[PDB]
Amino acid sequence: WVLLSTVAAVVLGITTGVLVREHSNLSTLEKFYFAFPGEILMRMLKLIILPLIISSMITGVAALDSNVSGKIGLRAVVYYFCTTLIAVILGIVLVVSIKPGVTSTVDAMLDLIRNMFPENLVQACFQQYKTKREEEYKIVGMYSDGINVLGLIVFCLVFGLVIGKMGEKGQILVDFFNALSDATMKIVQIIMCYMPLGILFLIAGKIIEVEDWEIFRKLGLYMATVLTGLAIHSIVILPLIYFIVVRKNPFRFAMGMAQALLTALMISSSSATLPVTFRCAEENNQVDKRITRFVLPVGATINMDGTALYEAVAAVFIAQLNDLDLGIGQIITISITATSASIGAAGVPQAGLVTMVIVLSAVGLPAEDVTLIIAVDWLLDRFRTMVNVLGDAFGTGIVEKLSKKELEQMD
Amino acid sequence: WVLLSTVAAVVLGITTGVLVREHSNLSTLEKFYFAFPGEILMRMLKLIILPLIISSMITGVAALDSNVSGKIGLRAVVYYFCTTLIAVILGIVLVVSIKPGVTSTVDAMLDLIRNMFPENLVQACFQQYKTKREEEYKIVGMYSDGINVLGLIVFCLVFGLVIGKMGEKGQILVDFFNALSDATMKIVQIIMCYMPLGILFLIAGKIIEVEDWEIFRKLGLYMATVLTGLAIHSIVILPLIYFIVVRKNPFRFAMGMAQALLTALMISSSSATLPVTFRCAEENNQVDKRITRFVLPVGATINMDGTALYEAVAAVFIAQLNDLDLGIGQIITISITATSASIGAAGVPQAGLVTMVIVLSAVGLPAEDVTLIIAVDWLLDRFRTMVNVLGDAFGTGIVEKLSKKELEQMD
Amino acid sequence: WVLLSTVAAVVLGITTGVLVREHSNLSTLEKFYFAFPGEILMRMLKLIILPLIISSMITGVAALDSNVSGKIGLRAVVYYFCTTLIAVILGIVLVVSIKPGVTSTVDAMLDLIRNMFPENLVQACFQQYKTKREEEYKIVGMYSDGINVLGLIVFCLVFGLVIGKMGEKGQILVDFFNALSDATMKIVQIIMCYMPLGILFLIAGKIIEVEDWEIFRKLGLYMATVLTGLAIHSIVILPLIYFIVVRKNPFRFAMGMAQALLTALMISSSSATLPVTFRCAEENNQVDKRITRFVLPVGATINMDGTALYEAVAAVFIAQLNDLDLGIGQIITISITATSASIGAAGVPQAGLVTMVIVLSAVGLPAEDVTLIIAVDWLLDRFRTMVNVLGDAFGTGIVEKLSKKELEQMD
């Protein structure tokens, strides 16, 4: 339904945007009031990212302290983090080399570490430390505005780790933030019911302001960057990581998953294709049932390889749409926030847009340009879910070869 | 006791204010140090409105999710909201037409909706978005200071609704905020024990600074606006709402409540007159015992019709005392905050002053002028409680006629 | 271990600081990057003082509501507060008269009370009210930056008192903040494992910038102020307070504790010397076993007389190192924050440095000068623990004479 009511928001936002621009004449003021229902959506999204980051980081890290089954549980979590970090790095490199959207460096890397450890937890919810080399030179910090996403991710990772080790003493803190993450995931679902009304007026506000045909050549080159990144990650990278640790011809392993990949296109949900990819791994690729019963359940909500690469591409595409280049201190902030968005969205396909707003707010990019991401998101969301279950599929074969001593011992 | 120790604070603040002004000569500096124990009270009141709004909204809305008994529970809650909204609108119209205290408009209505959905939850506790049309014109927001009461009311209404539907999963969040609202209601009682000392020095600071006899003609016209509003609401409005839905001569229904209205004057508590207005509805007006056992218990702490009208009049009277006119974007902010002050004070007659500070802080009005409200509050508090139980009395007759099919089915 | 790895941080910070200054030449920029691992430690310390103050005040005050055993429980708590307030006053007077580190007043005392009751709880976490007499004069407040430690101590004392009286209703709030104080005490232990790396680069940053031999004459006069204060408090004050209430020759009582004082030097922990000072009070000074089983357990984590005097001296020594004099409104802020640091560190010897940062942040002093406190802290920490157990030892003799009717009644 939500795909059908977002495609309807884009089509009726384009039809409104061309029957208003060609049949009327608005000033700079009426074009601001026309895009007002989308401005309300853009601050309903920013409203919810502060309890979403806090609750999902504390609960997701404290859940991983309880889900790790010794060495099989640790090798699957380690594998999910490297492939996500490789898909983000592949997404960063591809969008910087191609550059769709176009036409000191040591004080930016030290501002990265100063923002991971803020001087106050309450100011981290709305302010960021920025430093400035000036005057044989001095260095001055300012504490500019915008939510410090790195300071809240690092604190809630350390806080969520501590409560997991406390056990009985901290069970009221685990239970508090579990109910807090279930509550804000239901508010995110309320905002996503308003979202087709907001995307309609915010797409139509963009169609009024264009005079060129160059914004659509940039959106076509943005889709050809995500689809290039999803093709390099699924054919060149993820078969190679299989072949480094399992010398067993990774393309025969991928053809054995062919029934699970095609149903990842029709349903377009990585968690709703679980009972097909469970049997399609064991009946065909002869993987152990003990590894499959852990890797595929925790992997369908943690291993998001296609989503991480797409968010990395889309945030730098917005930062090239608005004429910036981000340096390097903002590129690492993309690469941490897009990687930690696996935990920061607690296994929900609804939160694909709001994790986009977390990545854009971690740098300071305009969140109103996310409608150009949403207007072509329905085309690419099918192919992200195919890569999200392929990294889960290749994880059952990789963790099994690494844990061959745990399968002669568990019997 | 608390009425006797507030009337003593006003009389000993007037006696101090005329033995200091006529027998001494203070500068602008000693008149500021003289009103210092009242300045401490004015920031002890503002200190507590942030955990009071948050905890009472989350618990009051999550309680209404559990108290609604199908259609009888929904018709009583719907009736309590319309009469409160009518008494506020009647209070706004009367204080604007009479004007006691005297002698763009589209960017103010859109600032109302921008403040209902703030961009950050932590900045909503101390900052408000204001917009500015400038330059063929542009529009700039600024995020000025002062607590965003609408953003916290709307979020905690949506948050309190979500936890009520979660049930077992969110029971730790219901239990957390229940204990948080019981804790801050005990801190409000501690501040109200300091309040006679603070009102003494803050009344006496006003008596020093007057040179006219015009501030008392404005306070007399303020009491003649509340008492006019309580007379129109109890004779013209609330009998008419009975006659629209129950064609049964509403003044005979009101004479049947005459024993409950007179004991609402002596005790001056709408919750402490319950066991008299229970029997006086059934023994006289022949109302069903099944409707009375729900409408009157939840109505004595929710249906506050005389309090809502009085707060609406008093906040615009302060906004006419200090020379303003509020436009229309601040008048709707009165009409939401005074209406939601039924839930925002969890059934306590102590919190009549602090809900006044919530309404004055929702706009940005000076909270130090609440002593002119307090100095005549003991005269009018008797008549507010009579209207607060008359809307409860008329609610048993209205909900019974609307729910005639639920009384042939429940047997 | 932690003493051995901090003495190693000071020695290797002095050896680095003299092989860099004499063998190289840095600009103003490379001297800032050299002290960068210590700058990260200085904002990891400030990060944790906000959940440490809040959780330890709410839990420590709500624990004292449950630990008081009538009159024996009240006399021990009252005795712990006066001796701590006397040792702070003795520390303030000695550092002002000697002045190691060298070479309106009514608007500062009213700013003290305005900051105890802030206008907002969220702004109290990062802002402080300061007032300004200007223009026959007016008075203007500004709300400058820096965390309001007095507003959070006073609120969490009133909040922690209310939850203790609520009992069953507020048991979820006691259980929430107990787990929150156990969680942030484990994060403080993580920061103290980074602390030898941070102190190394922050000591070495000071050795580069000196050209004189005058900073070491000030550090020697700072140790001769703490050791003078610990000698006056343990020989002149605490024997006198014994002799006022117990006419039993206080030096014979102190010689009876000689086995407990010497093991307070070797172990250097006031809580780890409990099973020696239990028997050494009863076997020698013939104190009752009913008073000893309460006074010494709650006193080893509350009665910190040597720590309170040392923090009072060290904060004014930093405020004389950086050329200030603090007036009197900042001296009372030292005397409240150093006194309440008994509750604000929940019985942990790790938190001696972070309570130093709380006292320096309560005024607004530079926290980077705490390395001169740390570099000589290992010399003085042995003698603070001897005074911390001597006030506990003298407390068993004082509370017993005050409670002679409770020991003829309890049998």
From Swiss-Prot, chains A, B, C:
Coiled coil: none annotated. Changing residue 382 to W: In DCBXA; reduces L-glutamate and L-cysteine transport activities; reduces cell membrane expression. The chain crosses the membrane at residues 1-20, 44-64, 76-96, 143-166, 176-203, 224-245, 291-317, 378-399. Gene3D superfamilies: Sodium:dicarboxylate symporter (1.10.3860.10). Residues 21-43, 204-223, 318-330, 365-377 are extracellular. Na(+) 1 binds at residues 80, 83-84, 299, 303, 305, 388, 392. SUPFAM superfamilies: Proton glutamate symport protein (SSF118215). It is a multi-pass membrane protein. It comes from the Eukaryota. Glycosylated. Na(+) 2 binds at residues 301, 342-343, 345. GO terms for molecular function: chloride transmembrane transporter activity; cysteine transmembrane transporter activity; D-aspartate transmembrane transporter activity; glutamate:sodium symporter activity; high-affinity L-glutamate transmembrane transporter activity; identical protein binding; L-aspartate transmembrane transporter activity; L-glutamate transmembrane transporter activity. Residues 65-75, 167-175, 246-250, 282-290 are cytoplasmic. Its main location: membrane. Expressed in all tissues tested including liver, muscle, testis, ovary, retinoblastoma cell line, neurons and brain (in which there was dense expression in substantia nigra, red nucleus, hippocampus and in cerebral cortical layers). Belongs to the dicarboxylate/amino acid:cation symporter (DAACS) (TC 2.A.23) family. SLC1A1 subfamily. Sodium-dependent, high-affinity amino acid transporter that mediates the uptake of L-glutamate and also L-aspartate and D-aspartate. Can also transport L-cysteine. Functions as a symporter that transports one amino acid molecule together with two or three Na(+) ions and one proton, in parallel with the counter-transport of one K(+) ion. Mediates Cl(-) flux that is not coupled to amino acid transport; this avoids the accumulation of negative charges due to aspartate and Na(+) symport. Plays an important role in L-glutamate and L-aspartate reabsorption in renal tubuli. Homotrimer. Interacts with ARL6IP5. Interacts with RTN2 (via N-terminus); the interaction promotes cell surface expression of SLC1A1. Interacts with SORCS2; this interaction is important for normal expression at the cell membrane. This is Excitatory amino acid transporter 3. It comes from Homo sapiens. The gene is SLC1A1.
